[PDB]
Amino acid sequence: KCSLTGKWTNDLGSNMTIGAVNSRGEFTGTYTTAVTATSNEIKESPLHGTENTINKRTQPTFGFTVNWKFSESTTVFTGQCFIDRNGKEVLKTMWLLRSSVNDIGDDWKATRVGINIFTRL
Amino acid sequence: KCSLTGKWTNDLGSNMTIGAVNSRGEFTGTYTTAVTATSNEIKESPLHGTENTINKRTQPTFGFTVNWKFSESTTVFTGQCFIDRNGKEVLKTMWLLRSSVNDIGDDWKATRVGINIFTRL
Amino acid sequence: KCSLTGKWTNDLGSNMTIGAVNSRGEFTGTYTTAVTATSNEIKESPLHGTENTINKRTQPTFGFTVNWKFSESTTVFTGQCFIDRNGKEVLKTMWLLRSSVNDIGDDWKATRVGINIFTRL
Amino acid sequence: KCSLTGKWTNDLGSNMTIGAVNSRGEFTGTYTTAVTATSNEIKESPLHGTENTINKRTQPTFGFTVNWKFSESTTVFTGQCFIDRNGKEVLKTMWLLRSSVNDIGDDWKATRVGINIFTRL
Ligand SMILES: O=C(O)CCCC[C@@H]1SC[C@@H]2NC(=O)N[C@@H]21
Ligand SMILES: O=C(O)CCCC[C@@H]1SC[C@@H]2NC(=O)N[C@@H]21
Ligand SMILES: O=C(O)CCCC[C@@H]1SC[C@@H]2NC(=O)N[C@@H]21
Ligand SMILES: O=C(O)CCCC[C@@H]1SC[C@@H]2NC(=O)N[C@@H]21
Ligand SMILES: *[C@H]1O[C@H](CO)[C@@H](O)[C@H](O)[C@H]1NC(C)=O
Ligand SMILES: *[C@H]1O[C@H](CO)[C@@H](O)[C@H](O)[C@H]1NC(C)=O
Ligand SMILES: *[C@H]1O[C@H](CO)[C@@H](O)[C@H](O)[C@H]1NC(C)=O
Ligand SMILES: *[C@H]1O[C@H](CO)[C@@H](O)[C@H](O)[C@H]1NC(C)=O
Questions:
Q1: How is it modified after translation (chains A, B, C, D)?
Q2: Residue A57: its chain B contacts at CB < 8 A?
Protein backbone atom coordinates (compact mmCIF):
# COMPACT_ATOMS: atom_id res chain seq x y z
CA LYS A 1 0.00 0.00 0.00
CA CYS A 2 1.28 3.49 -0.59
CA SER A 3 1.63 5.42 2.63
CA LEU A 4 1.82 9.14 3.27
CA THR A 5 3.25 8.63 6.74
CA GLY A 6 7.00 9.37 6.59
CA LYS A 7 9.80 11.78 5.64
CA TRP A 8 9.76 12.79 1.95
CA THR A 9 11.91 14.95 -0.32
CA ASN A 10 11.13 16.52 -3.71
CA ASP A 11 12.65 17.45 -7.06
CA LEU A 12 13.16 21.02 -5.81
CA GLY A 13 14.80 19.92 -2.59
CA SER A 14 12.05 20.76 -0.12
CA ASN A 15 11.49 18.16 2.60
CA MET A 16 8.18 17.32 4.21
CA THR A 17 7.12 15.12 7.07
CA ILE A 18 3.69 13.62 7.34
CA GLY A 19 2.53 11.79 10.40
CA ALA A 20 0.12 8.99 11.16
CA VAL A 21 -3.10 9.58 9.18
CA ASN A 22 -6.02 8.79 11.39
CA SER A 23 -9.28 6.94 10.71
CA ARG A 24 -10.86 9.97 9.14
CA GLY A 25 -7.97 9.88 6.69
CA GLU A 26 -6.56 13.07 8.19
CA PHE A 27 -2.96 13.93 8.85
CA THR A 28 -0.52 16.77 9.72
CA GLY A 29 3.18 17.45 9.26
CA THR A 30 5.74 20.11 8.55
CA TYR A 31 7.11 21.46 5.24
CA THR A 32 10.60 22.92 4.88
CA THR A 33 10.65 24.39 1.43
CA ALA A 34 13.98 24.81 -0.32
CA VAL A 35 12.82 27.66 -2.53
CA THR A 36 10.36 30.58 -2.31
CA ALA A 37 8.73 33.11 -4.63
CA THR A 38 9.21 35.66 -1.83
CA SER A 39 12.67 36.97 -1.07
CA ASN A 40 11.52 36.60 2.63
CA GLU A 41 13.48 34.24 4.91
CA ILE A 42 12.25 30.67 4.69
CA LYS A 43 10.90 29.02 7.82
CA GLU A 44 9.49 25.54 8.34
CA SER A 45 5.72 25.87 8.08
CA PRO A 46 2.87 23.61 9.22
CA LEU A 47 0.90 21.27 6.94
CA HIS A 48 -2.56 19.92 7.61
CA GLY A 49 -4.13 17.70 4.93
CA THR A 50 -6.38 14.69 4.09
CA GLU A 51 -6.39 11.43 2.07
CA ASN A 52 -9.33 9.63 0.40
CA THR A 53 -10.46 6.27 1.86
CA ILE A 54 -13.74 5.50 0.04
CA ASN A 55 -12.68 2.05 -1.32
CA LYS A 56 -9.70 1.74 1.12
CA ARG A 57 -7.48 2.22 -1.94
CA THR A 58 -3.78 1.14 -2.05
CA GLN A 59 -2.64 4.12 -3.97
CA PRO A 60 -4.80 6.81 -2.44
CA THR A 61 -5.73 10.28 -3.71
CA PHE A 62 -4.82 13.12 -1.30
CA GLY A 63 -4.51 16.85 -0.78
CA PHE A 64 -2.96 19.13 1.84
CA THR A 65 -2.58 22.82 2.66
CA VAL A 66 0.65 24.65 3.65
CA ASN A 67 0.24 27.66 5.92
CA TRP A 68 3.23 29.77 5.07
CA LYS A 69 4.74 31.17 8.26
CA PHE A 70 7.27 33.43 6.45
CA SER A 71 4.82 34.88 3.83
CA GLU A 72 1.14 35.84 3.55
CA SER A 73 0.50 33.16 0.88
CA THR A 74 -1.02 29.70 0.99
CA THR A 75 -0.27 26.64 -1.10
CA VAL A 76 -2.36 23.55 -1.81
CA PHE A 77 -1.08 20.27 -3.37
CA THR A 78 -3.17 17.39 -4.70
CA GLY A 79 -1.69 14.15 -5.81
CA GLN A 80 -1.62 10.44 -5.48
CA CYS A 81 0.49 7.96 -3.61
CA PHE A 82 1.87 5.58 -6.28
CA ILE A 83 4.01 2.43 -6.25
CA ASP A 84 6.27 3.09 -9.27
CA ARG A 85 7.20 0.24 -11.66
CA ASN A 86 10.53 -0.04 -9.84
CA GLY A 87 8.74 -1.02 -6.63
CA LYS A 88 9.11 2.26 -4.84
CA GLU A 89 6.76 4.95 -3.50
CA VAL A 90 6.40 8.22 -5.31
CA LEU A 91 3.93 11.04 -4.83
CA LYS A 92 2.99 12.83 -8.00
CA THR A 93 1.54 16.12 -6.86
CA MET A 94 0.36 19.26 -8.61
CA TRP A 95 0.02 22.53 -6.75
CA LEU A 96 -1.52 26.01 -6.81
CA LEU A 97 0.31 28.78 -4.99
CA ARG A 98 -1.95 31.72 -4.05
CA SER A 99 -0.44 35.10 -3.36
CA SER A 100 -2.08 37.90 -1.34
CA VAL A 101 -3.09 40.87 -3.48
CA ASN A 102 -4.50 44.13 -2.06
CA ASP A 103 -7.39 45.29 -4.23
CA ILE A 104 -9.65 42.62 -5.70
CA GLY A 105 -8.73 43.92 -9.12
CA ASP A 106 -5.25 42.42 -8.88
CA ASP A 107 -6.59 38.93 -8.24
CA TRP A 108 -6.23 37.80 -11.90
CA LYS A 109 -2.52 37.23 -11.24
CA ALA A 110 -2.45 35.88 -7.72
CA THR A 111 -2.14 32.21 -8.60
CA ARG A 112 0.80 30.07 -9.70
CA VAL A 113 0.47 26.42 -10.91
CA GLY A 114 3.09 23.66 -10.70
CA ILE A 115 4.44 20.12 -10.24
CA ASN A 116 6.37 18.19 -7.60
CA ILE A 117 7.43 14.53 -7.32
CA PHE A 118 8.03 13.56 -3.68
CA THR A 119 10.18 10.50 -2.99
CA ARG A 120 10.87 8.80 0.32
CA LEU A 121 13.53 10.94 2.00
CA LYS B 1 -12.39 42.02 8.30
CA CYS B 2 -13.31 39.31 5.82
CA SER B 3 -14.49 36.24 7.74
CA LEU B 4 -14.53 32.69 6.49
CA THR B 5 -16.84 31.38 9.20
CA GLY B 6 -20.28 31.01 7.66
CA LYS B 7 -22.56 29.57 5.03
CA TRP B 8 -21.47 30.10 1.47
CA THR B 9 -22.70 29.24 -2.05
CA ASN B 10 -20.98 29.48 -5.46
CA ASP B 11 -21.46 29.96 -9.21
CA LEU B 12 -21.84 26.27 -9.95
CA GLY B 13 -24.45 26.32 -7.21
CA SER B 14 -22.61 24.42 -4.48
CA ASN B 15 -23.01 25.26 -0.79
CA MET B 16 -20.34 25.04 1.89
CA THR B 17 -20.24 25.70 5.65
CA ILE B 18 -17.15 26.75 7.58
CA GLY B 19 -17.18 27.13 11.31
CA ALA B 20 -14.84 28.76 13.78
CA VAL B 21 -11.30 29.22 12.42
CA ASN B 22 -9.18 28.57 15.49
CA SER B 23 -6.21 30.59 16.75
CA ARG B 24 -3.89 28.43 14.57
CA GLY B 25 -5.85 29.48 11.48
CA GLU B 26 -7.56 26.07 11.21
CA PHE B 27 -11.22 25.30 10.35
CA THR B 28 -13.45 22.32 9.40
CA GLY B 29 -16.65 22.52 7.37
CA THR B 30 -18.99 20.65 5.06
CA TYR B 31 -19.21 20.86 1.23
CA THR B 32 -22.40 20.11 -0.70
CA THR B 33 -21.51 20.20 -4.32
CA ALA B 34 -24.25 20.83 -6.84
CA VAL B 35 -22.12 19.27 -9.58
CA THR B 36 -19.93 16.18 -10.01
CA ALA B 37 -17.48 14.85 -12.62
CA THR B 38 -18.47 11.31 -11.70
CA SER B 39 -21.91 9.79 -12.43
CA ASN B 40 -21.98 8.73 -8.73
CA GLU B 41 -24.56 10.07 -6.30
CA ILE B 42 -23.38 13.28 -4.60
CA LYS B 43 -22.88 13.28 -0.83
CA GLU B 44 -22.01 16.11 1.53
CA SER B 45 -18.30 15.89 2.34
CA PRO B 46 -15.78 17.11 4.96
CA LEU B 47 -13.63 20.19 4.57
CA HIS B 48 -10.26 20.74 6.29
CA GLY B 49 -8.63 24.05 5.43
CA THR B 50 -6.50 26.78 6.99
CA GLU B 51 -6.22 30.59 6.72
CA ASN B 52 -2.79 32.28 6.64
CA THR B 53 -2.29 34.57 9.62
CA ILE B 54 1.00 36.45 8.93
CA ASN B 55 0.17 40.21 9.38
CA LYS B 56 -3.30 39.67 10.97
CA ARG B 57 -4.69 40.42 7.53
CA THR B 58 -8.21 41.75 7.04
CA GLN B 59 -8.46 40.07 3.67
CA PRO B 60 -6.72 36.79 4.42
CA THR B 61 -5.35 34.04 2.26
CA PHE B 62 -6.67 30.47 2.68
CA GLY B 63 -6.69 26.92 1.34
CA PHE B 64 -8.79 23.81 2.08
CA THR B 65 -9.10 20.15 1.09
CA VAL B 66 -12.44 18.50 0.22
CA ASN B 67 -12.54 14.75 0.97
CA TRP B 68 -15.23 13.41 -1.38
CA LYS B 69 -17.40 10.71 0.22
CA PHE B 70 -18.98 9.74 -3.07
CA SER B 71 -15.76 9.29 -5.12
CA GLU B 72 -12.11 8.33 -4.85
CA SER B 73 -11.09 11.93 -5.53
CA THR B 74 -9.81 14.95 -3.66
CA THR B 75 -10.21 18.64 -4.49
CA VAL B 76 -8.02 21.43 -3.12
CA PHE B 77 -9.19 25.03 -3.09
CA THR B 78 -6.96 28.14 -2.67
CA GLY B 79 -8.08 31.73 -2.79
CA GLN B 80 -8.57 34.90 -0.76
CA CYS B 81 -11.15 36.75 1.32
CA PHE B 82 -12.03 39.97 -0.44
CA ILE B 83 -14.47 42.59 0.64
CA ASP B 84 -16.10 43.65 -2.62
CA ARG B 85 -16.39 47.36 -3.48
CA ASN B 86 -20.19 47.26 -2.94
CA GLY B 87 -19.52 46.23 0.66
CA LYS B 88 -19.69 42.42 0.54
CA GLU B 89 -17.40 39.50 1.31
CA VAL B 90 -16.59 37.58 -1.83
CA LEU B 91 -14.42 34.47 -1.98
CA LYS B 92 -12.19 34.16 -5.06
CA THR B 93 -10.73 30.65 -5.49
CA MET B 94 -9.08 28.26 -7.93
CA TRP B 95 -9.24 24.52 -7.25
CA LEU B 96 -7.37 21.44 -8.39
CA LEU B 97 -9.36 18.16 -8.88
CA ARG B 98 -7.42 14.90 -8.39
CA SER B 99 -8.93 11.68 -9.75
CA SER B 100 -7.48 8.26 -8.92
CA VAL B 101 -5.77 6.53 -11.78
CA ASN B 102 -5.18 2.76 -11.71
CA ASP B 103 -1.62 2.97 -13.15
CA ILE B 104 1.04 5.71 -12.66
CA GLY B 105 1.28 5.71 -16.44
CA ASP B 106 -2.04 7.47 -16.57
CA ASP B 107 -1.23 10.13 -14.00
CA TRP B 108 -0.95 12.78 -16.72
CA LYS B 109 -4.74 13.30 -17.06
CA ALA B 110 -5.82 12.89 -13.43
CA THR B 111 -5.68 16.59 -12.52
CA ARG B 112 -8.33 19.16 -13.56
CA VAL B 113 -8.36 22.87 -12.94
CA GLY B 114 -10.83 25.71 -12.49
CA ILE B 115 -12.32 28.74 -10.71
CA ASN B 116 -15.11 29.31 -8.17
CA ILE B 117 -16.60 32.53 -6.78
CA PHE B 118 -18.20 32.11 -3.39
CA THR B 119 -20.65 34.46 -1.78
CA ARG B 120 -22.38 34.55 1.62
CA LEU B 121 -25.29 32.06 1.44
CA LYS C 1 -22.92 28.06 -34.86
CA CYS C 2 -20.51 29.75 -32.53
CA SER C 3 -17.99 31.85 -34.39
CA LEU C 4 -14.61 33.16 -33.33
CA THR C 5 -14.56 35.74 -36.11
CA GLY C 6 -15.37 39.14 -34.56
CA LYS C 7 -14.58 41.78 -31.91
CA TRP C 8 -14.76 40.44 -28.33
CA THR C 9 -14.34 41.89 -24.85
CA ASN C 10 -13.67 40.17 -21.51
CA ASP C 11 -14.42 40.33 -17.79
CA LEU C 12 -11.10 42.14 -17.23
CA GLY C 13 -11.73 44.66 -19.98
CA SER C 14 -9.23 43.47 -22.56
CA ASN C 15 -10.51 43.49 -26.14
CA MET C 16 -9.53 41.06 -28.86
CA THR C 17 -10.22 40.80 -32.55
CA ILE C 18 -10.16 37.54 -34.42
CA GLY C 19 -10.43 37.37 -38.16
CA ALA C 20 -11.77 34.91 -40.68
CA VAL C 21 -10.63 31.40 -39.69
CA ASN C 22 -9.58 29.56 -42.79
CA SER C 23 -10.18 25.99 -43.93
CA ARG C 24 -7.39 24.65 -41.78
CA GLY C 25 -9.28 26.15 -38.86
CA GLU C 26 -6.56 28.77 -38.41
CA PHE C 27 -6.95 32.40 -37.55
CA THR C 28 -5.11 35.57 -36.40
CA GLY C 29 -6.04 38.79 -34.63
CA THR C 30 -4.87 41.37 -32.15
CA TYR C 31 -5.18 41.52 -28.34
CA THR C 32 -5.31 44.77 -26.39
CA THR C 33 -5.06 43.73 -22.80
CA ALA C 34 -6.46 46.03 -20.14
CA VAL C 35 -4.17 44.76 -17.39
CA THR C 36 -0.61 43.37 -17.10
CA ALA C 37 1.53 41.57 -14.53
CA THR C 38 4.42 43.75 -15.74
CA SER C 39 4.50 47.42 -14.82
CA ASN C 40 5.70 47.86 -18.49
CA GLU C 41 3.57 49.98 -20.86
CA ILE C 42 0.82 47.96 -22.52
CA LYS C 43 0.81 47.69 -26.29
CA GLU C 44 -1.57 45.85 -28.61
CA SER C 45 0.06 42.51 -29.36
CA PRO C 46 -0.52 39.95 -32.13
CA LEU C 47 -2.52 36.72 -31.72
CA HIS C 48 -2.20 33.64 -33.88
CA GLY C 49 -4.37 30.63 -32.96
CA THR C 50 -6.41 27.60 -34.16
CA GLU C 51 -9.88 25.98 -33.78
CA ASN C 52 -10.85 22.28 -33.96
CA THR C 53 -12.94 21.11 -36.95
CA ILE C 54 -12.93 17.29 -36.67
CA ASN C 55 -16.77 16.84 -36.62
CA LYS C 56 -17.43 20.41 -37.97
CA ARG C 57 -18.74 21.20 -34.48
CA THR C 58 -21.11 24.15 -33.75
CA GLN C 59 -19.49 25.05 -30.51
CA PRO C 60 -15.86 24.42 -31.35
CA THR C 61 -12.84 23.88 -29.09
CA PHE C 62 -9.98 26.36 -29.71
CA GLY C 63 -6.66 27.72 -28.52
CA PHE C 64 -4.47 30.71 -29.36
CA THR C 65 -1.12 32.25 -28.42
CA VAL C 66 -0.43 35.93 -27.56
CA ASN C 67 3.04 37.21 -28.38
CA TRP C 68 3.53 39.99 -25.89
CA LYS C 69 5.13 42.96 -27.60
CA PHE C 70 5.64 44.97 -24.36
CA SER C 71 7.05 42.06 -22.23
CA GLU C 72 9.20 38.94 -22.68
CA SER C 73 6.29 36.64 -21.68
CA THR C 74 3.85 34.54 -23.66
CA THR C 75 0.26 33.61 -22.92
CA VAL C 76 -1.88 30.76 -24.21
CA PHE C 77 -5.70 30.46 -23.86
CA THR C 78 -7.85 27.39 -24.53
CA GLY C 79 -11.58 27.48 -24.48
CA GLN C 80 -14.77 26.80 -26.28
CA CYS C 81 -17.18 28.85 -28.31
CA PHE C 82 -20.58 28.40 -26.59
CA ILE C 83 -24.14 29.55 -27.29
CA ASP C 84 -25.30 30.44 -23.74
CA ARG C 85 -28.86 29.59 -22.60
CA ASN C 86 -29.82 33.21 -23.30
CA GLY C 87 -29.05 32.74 -27.00
CA LYS C 88 -25.78 34.58 -27.06
CA GLU C 89 -22.14 33.70 -27.79
CA VAL C 90 -19.67 33.40 -24.99
CA LEU C 91 -16.13 32.09 -24.95
CA LYS C 92 -15.13 30.37 -21.76
CA THR C 93 -11.37 30.34 -21.81
CA MET C 94 -8.69 29.31 -19.34
CA TRP C 95 -5.14 30.55 -19.69
CA LEU C 96 -1.52 29.99 -18.64
CA LEU C 97 0.77 33.01 -18.52
CA ARG C 98 4.48 32.10 -18.77
CA SER C 99 7.09 34.51 -17.51
CA SER C 100 10.76 34.56 -18.57
CA VAL C 101 13.12 33.48 -15.79
CA ASN C 102 16.93 33.59 -16.07
CA ASP C 103 18.39 30.43 -14.58
CA ILE C 104 16.46 27.20 -15.09
CA GLY C 105 16.24 26.89 -11.34
CA ASP C 106 13.69 29.70 -11.15
CA ASP C 107 11.31 27.97 -13.54
CA TRP C 108 9.10 26.50 -10.76
CA LYS C 109 7.41 29.90 -10.46
CA ALA C 110 7.24 31.11 -14.03
CA THR C 111 3.64 30.16 -14.71
CA ARG C 112 0.33 31.78 -13.78
CA VAL C 113 -3.11 30.13 -14.36
CA GLY C 114 -6.46 31.88 -14.91
CA ILE C 115 -9.94 32.42 -16.37
CA ASN C 116 -11.58 34.76 -18.87
CA ILE C 117 -15.11 34.95 -20.32
CA PHE C 118 -15.10 36.76 -23.68
CA THR C 119 -18.39 38.22 -24.91
CA ARG C 120 -19.17 39.80 -28.26
CA LEU C 121 -17.79 43.34 -28.03
CA LYS D 1 21.09 30.48 -28.19
CA CYS D 2 18.33 28.00 -27.46
CA SER D 3 16.65 27.04 -30.74
CA LEU D 4 13.16 25.65 -31.15
CA THR D 5 13.68 24.45 -34.71
CA GLY D 6 14.19 20.69 -34.56
CA LYS D 7 13.00 17.26 -33.57
CA TRP D 8 12.00 16.86 -29.96
CA THR D 9 10.66 14.12 -27.66
CA ASN D 10 9.22 14.27 -24.12
CA ASP D 11 8.71 12.40 -20.84
CA LEU D 12 5.39 10.89 -21.84
CA GLY D 13 7.23 9.75 -24.96
CA SER D 14 5.67 12.06 -27.54
CA ASN D 15 7.66 13.43 -30.49
CA MET D 16 7.25 16.84 -32.10
CA THR D 17 8.91 18.65 -35.02
CA ILE D 18 9.25 22.41 -35.33
CA GLY D 19 10.70 24.03 -38.39
CA ALA D 20 11.99 27.49 -39.14
CA VAL D 21 10.66 30.15 -36.73
CA ASN D 22 10.20 33.13 -39.03
CA SER D 23 11.24 36.74 -38.39
CA ARG D 24 7.83 37.37 -36.72
CA GLY D 25 8.57 34.61 -34.21
CA GLU D 26 6.13 32.19 -35.90
CA PHE D 27 6.57 28.44 -36.56
CA THR D 28 4.51 25.38 -37.64
CA GLY D 29 5.28 21.77 -36.77
CA THR D 30 3.83 18.32 -36.25
CA TYR D 31 2.97 16.58 -32.93
CA THR D 32 2.93 12.80 -32.53
CA THR D 33 1.60 12.10 -29.11
CA ALA D 34 2.43 8.78 -27.49
CA VAL D 35 -0.54 9.15 -25.15
CA THR D 36 -4.20 10.17 -25.42
CA ALA D 37 -7.06 10.93 -23.00
CA THR D 38 -9.53 9.61 -25.57
CA SER D 39 -9.80 5.93 -26.58
CA ASN D 40 -9.61 7.16 -30.22
CA GLU D 41 -6.74 6.22 -32.52
CA ILE D 42 -3.86 8.71 -32.30
CA LYS D 43 -2.92 10.72 -35.40
CA GLU D 44 -0.07 13.13 -35.99
CA SER D 45 -1.41 16.67 -35.68
CA PRO D 46 -0.51 20.26 -36.68
CA LEU D 47 1.28 22.71 -34.42
CA HIS D 48 1.01 26.52 -34.68
CA GLY D 49 3.05 28.37 -32.09
CA THR D 50 5.11 31.53 -31.66
CA GLU D 51 8.27 32.55 -29.76
CA ASN D 52 8.45 35.94 -27.98
CA THR D 53 11.16 38.15 -29.43
CA ILE D 54 11.37 41.19 -27.09
CA ASN D 55 15.12 41.53 -26.16
CA LYS D 56 16.42 39.02 -28.78
CA ARG D 57 16.58 36.55 -25.92
CA THR D 58 18.93 33.56 -25.99
CA GLN D 59 16.54 31.55 -23.86
CA PRO D 60 13.23 32.62 -25.36
CA THR D 61 9.66 32.28 -24.23
CA PHE D 62 7.14 30.45 -26.47
CA GLY D 63 3.63 29.05 -26.80
CA PHE D 64 1.91 26.78 -29.35
CA THR D 65 -1.49 25.23 -30.11
CA VAL D 66 -1.94 21.55 -31.04
CA ASN D 67 -4.98 20.90 -33.27
CA TRP D 68 -5.85 17.25 -32.61
CA LYS D 69 -6.93 15.37 -35.75
CA PHE D 70 -8.16 12.39 -33.79
CA SER D 71 -10.38 14.26 -31.26
CA GLU D 72 -12.51 17.35 -30.81
CA SER D 73 -9.92 18.82 -28.43
CA THR D 74 -7.19 21.42 -28.40
CA THR D 75 -4.05 21.59 -26.27
CA VAL D 76 -2.01 24.74 -25.64
CA PHE D 77 1.60 24.56 -24.52
CA THR D 78 3.62 27.43 -22.93
CA GLY D 79 7.16 27.24 -21.66
CA GLN D 80 10.73 28.39 -22.24
CA CYS D 81 13.93 27.43 -24.02
CA PHE D 82 16.58 26.68 -21.43
CA ILE D 83 20.11 25.59 -21.98
CA ASP D 84 20.69 23.06 -19.23
CA ARG D 85 23.81 23.32 -17.03
CA ASN D 86 25.29 20.18 -18.65
CA GLY D 87 25.21 22.02 -21.98
CA LYS D 88 21.89 20.94 -23.52
CA GLU D 89 18.70 22.58 -24.72
CA VAL D 90 15.77 21.54 -22.58
CA LEU D 91 12.18 22.65 -23.09
CA LYS D 92 10.16 23.26 -19.91
CA THR D 93 6.40 23.53 -20.57
CA MET D 94 2.97 23.40 -18.98
CA TRP D 95 -0.06 22.67 -21.17
CA LEU D 96 -3.80 23.12 -20.91
CA LEU D 97 -6.09 20.40 -22.44
CA ARG D 98 -9.53 21.54 -23.65
CA SER D 99 -12.20 18.89 -24.27
CA SER D 100 -15.50 19.71 -25.97
CA VAL D 101 -18.51 19.62 -23.72
CA ASN D 102 -22.02 19.28 -25.17
CA ASP D 103 -23.60 21.86 -22.79
CA ILE D 104 -22.04 25.05 -21.29
CA GLY D 105 -23.25 23.68 -17.97
CA ASP D 106 -20.49 21.13 -18.11
CA ASP D 107 -17.70 23.53 -18.97
CA TRP D 108 -16.29 23.27 -15.45
CA LYS D 109 -14.51 19.92 -16.06
CA ALA D 110 -13.39 20.38 -19.68
CA THR D 111 -9.92 21.75 -18.88
CA ARG D 112 -6.98 19.59 -17.70
CA VAL D 113 -3.53 20.70 -16.70
CA GLY D 114 0.03 19.38 -16.64
CA ILE D 115 3.77 19.52 -17.35
CA ASN D 116 6.08 18.26 -20.12
CA ILE D 117 9.88 18.28 -20.42
CA PHE D 118 11.11 18.19 -23.98
CA THR D 119 14.56 17.25 -25.11
CA ARG D 120 16.30 17.17 -28.51
CA LEU D 121 15.15 13.95 -30.26
O1 LIG E 1 7.05 32.04 -1.61
C2 LIG E 1 6.12 31.88 -0.79
O3 LIG E 1 5.30 32.76 -0.51
C4 LIG E 1 5.98 30.58 -0.05
C5 LIG E 1 6.96 29.54 -0.50
C6 LIG E 1 6.56 28.97 -1.81
C7 LIG E 1 7.07 27.58 -1.94
C8 LIG E 1 6.50 26.87 -3.15
S9 LIG E 1 4.96 25.97 -2.92
C10 LIG E 1 5.20 25.07 -4.44
C11 LIG E 1 6.74 25.00 -4.75
N12 LIG E 1 7.30 23.69 -4.43
C13 LIG E 1 8.00 23.67 -3.31
O14 LIG E 1 8.56 22.69 -2.78
N15 LIG E 1 8.00 24.94 -2.82
C16 LIG E 1 7.49 25.89 -3.75
O1 LIG F 1 -16.58 14.21 -9.41
C2 LIG F 1 -15.94 13.95 -8.37
O3 LIG F 1 -15.09 13.04 -8.31
C4 LIG F 1 -16.13 14.84 -7.17
C5 LIG F 1 -16.96 16.10 -7.53
C6 LIG F 1 -16.27 17.38 -7.14
C7 LIG F 1 -16.93 18.53 -7.79
C8 LIG F 1 -15.95 19.56 -8.36
S9 LIG F 1 -14.52 20.02 -7.31
C10 LIG F 1 -14.41 21.69 -8.00
C11 LIG F 1 -15.69 22.01 -8.85
N12 LIG F 1 -16.50 23.09 -8.27
C13 LIG F 1 -17.50 22.64 -7.56
O14 LIG F 1 -18.19 23.27 -6.73
N15 LIG F 1 -17.66 21.33 -7.84
C16 LIG F 1 -16.68 20.85 -8.78
O1 LIG G 1 2.11 41.09 -18.07
C2 LIG G 1 2.56 40.58 -19.12
O3 LIG G 1 3.73 40.18 -19.23
C4 LIG G 1 1.69 40.46 -20.33
C5 LIG G 1 0.28 40.89 -20.09
C6 LIG G 1 -0.46 39.86 -19.31
C7 LIG G 1 -1.91 39.93 -19.63
C8 LIG G 1 -2.68 38.76 -19.05
S9 LIG G 1 -2.82 37.30 -20.09
C10 LIG G 1 -4.16 36.66 -19.08
C11 LIG G 1 -4.89 37.86 -18.39
N12 LIG G 1 -6.15 38.18 -19.05
C13 LIG G 1 -6.10 39.26 -19.80
O14 LIG G 1 -7.02 39.75 -20.50
N15 LIG G 1 -4.84 39.76 -19.70
C16 LIG G 1 -4.09 39.15 -18.65
O1 LIG H 1 -7.01 12.91 -25.76
C2 LIG H 1 -7.18 13.84 -26.58
O3 LIG H 1 -8.27 14.40 -26.76
C4 LIG H 1 -5.96 14.38 -27.29
C5 LIG H 1 -4.66 13.80 -26.71
C6 LIG H 1 -3.67 14.87 -26.31
C7 LIG H 1 -2.61 14.28 -25.47
C8 LIG H 1 -2.24 15.15 -24.26
S9 LIG H 1 -2.06 16.95 -24.55
C10 LIG H 1 -0.83 17.16 -23.22
C11 LIG H 1 -0.32 15.75 -22.74
N12 LIG H 1 1.10 15.53 -23.03
C13 LIG H 1 1.29 14.84 -24.13
O14 LIG H 1 2.35 14.73 -24.78
N15 LIG H 1 0.11 14.28 -24.48
C16 LIG H 1 -0.95 14.64 -23.58
C1 LIG I 1 16.06 18.30 4.09
O2 LIG I 1 16.78 17.21 3.50
C3 LIG I 1 18.10 16.97 4.03
C4 LIG I 1 18.07 15.71 4.92
O5 LIG I 1 16.71 15.32 5.21
C6 LIG I 1 18.64 18.21 4.81
O7 LIG I 1 20.07 18.18 4.87
C8 LIG I 1 18.19 19.51 4.13
O9 LIG I 1 18.85 20.60 4.68
C10 LIG I 1 16.71 19.67 4.26
N11 LIG I 1 16.27 20.67 3.28
C12 LIG I 1 15.63 21.77 3.70
C13 LIG I 1 15.24 22.79 2.65
O14 LIG I 1 15.24 21.89 4.86
C1 LIG J 1 -27.90 24.92 -0.98
O2 LIG J 1 -28.27 26.29 -0.96
C3 LIG J 1 -29.62 26.48 -0.57
C4 LIG J 1 -29.65 26.80 0.92
O5 LIG J 1 -28.72 25.97 1.64
C6 LIG J 1 -30.45 25.23 -0.85
O7 LIG J 1 -31.80 25.60 -0.96
C8 LIG J 1 -29.99 24.50 -2.13
O9 LIG J 1 -30.86 23.46 -2.46
C10 LIG J 1 -28.61 23.96 -1.91
N11 LIG J 1 -27.94 23.74 -3.20
C12 LIG J 1 -27.34 22.58 -3.47
C13 LIG J 1 -26.68 22.47 -4.83
O14 LIG J 1 -27.25 21.65 -2.65
C1 LIG K 1 -11.65 48.16 -26.02
O2 LIG K 1 -13.05 48.29 -25.75
C3 LIG K 1 -13.60 49.62 -25.92
C4 LIG K 1 -14.43 49.66 -27.21
O5 LIG K 1 -14.18 48.50 -28.03
C6 LIG K 1 -12.48 50.71 -25.91
O7 LIG K 1 -13.03 51.98 -25.55
C8 LIG K 1 -11.38 50.33 -24.92
O9 LIG K 1 -10.49 51.40 -24.75
C10 LIG K 1 -10.64 49.12 -25.40
N11 LIG K 1 -9.88 48.56 -24.27
C12 LIG K 1 -8.55 48.44 -24.37
C13 LIG K 1 -7.82 47.90 -23.16
O14 LIG K 1 -7.96 48.60 -25.43
C1 LIG L 1 9.13 8.98 -31.91
O2 LIG L 1 10.49 8.98 -31.47
C3 LIG L 1 11.27 8.00 -32.13
C4 LIG L 1 12.00 8.67 -33.28
O5 LIG L 1 11.14 9.59 -33.97
C6 LIG L 1 10.40 6.86 -32.65
O7 LIG L 1 11.20 5.72 -32.80
C8 LIG L 1 9.21 6.56 -31.72
O9 LIG L 1 8.52 5.41 -32.12
C10 LIG L 1 8.28 7.74 -31.73
N11 LIG L 1 7.45 7.75 -30.50
C12 LIG L 1 6.13 7.89 -30.58
C13 LIG L 1 5.39 7.88 -29.26
O14 LIG L 1 5.52 8.09 -31.64
A1: N-linked glycan at Asn-15 consists of GlcNAc(beta1-2)Man(alpha1-3)[GlcNAc(beta1-4)][Man(alpha1-?)Man(alpha1-6)] Man(beta1-4)GlcNAc(beta1-4)GlcNAc.
A2: 72, 100
